[PDB]
Copies of this chain bind each other. A is one copy, B any other.
Amino acid sequence: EDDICILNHEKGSGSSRHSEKIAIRDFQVGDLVLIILDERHDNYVLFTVSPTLYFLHSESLPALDLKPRPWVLGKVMEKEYCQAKKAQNRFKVPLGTKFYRVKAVSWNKKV
């Protein structure tokens, strides 16, 4: 263990400080989220661990200082359940796929 100095050590189940949190699945309006560029679907999307896609609404881009940056934090304000009606679509997803589109804004708070 000769390569590091240990400056402090903490154990326990909770603290008085609350880390900043993001949703990663089953997004709800009001959630704080991480918004990343999805090259394959040519769109910004929510970072997520689940296979349902949450696309960022194109009209939310100017409110997140984005342009049609790798990532930004935002706060979900609207959410739309959608189904692909034509086999070639703005979302590069097969015909009939069900997915979400979300509107988000920049947010300088940790909640």
List, in ascending order, chain B residues with CB within 8 A of A41's CB. none
Given contacts A3-B90, A24-B20, contact A80 B30 (CB under 8 A): no
Query: What CA separation (Å) do A98 and B14 show in the bound complex?
Result: 23
The reply to whether A29 and B11 form a contact with Cβ atoms under 8 Å apart is: yes
Q: Does A38 contact B (CB under 8 A)?
A: no
| CB 8 Å contact bits of A1-42 with B (1 = contact, 0 = none) | 011111111111111011111111111111100100000000
Interface residues, chain A, with chain B CB atoms under 8 Å away = 2-15, 17-31, 34, 49, 71, 73, 77-86, 88-91, 98, 101
Query: What CA separation (Å) do A77 and B9 show in the bound complex?
Result: 11
The 9 closest A-B pairs by CB, nearest first: A3-B89, A19-B23, A15-B28, A7-B81, A3-B86, A5-B83, A21-B21, A19-B26, A14-B30
The reply to whether B24 and A81 form a contact with Cβ atoms under 8 Å apart is: no
The reply to whether B29 and A25 form a contact with Cβ atoms under 8 Å apart is: no
List, in ascending order, chain B residues with CB within 8 A of A4's CB. 82-85, 89-91, 101
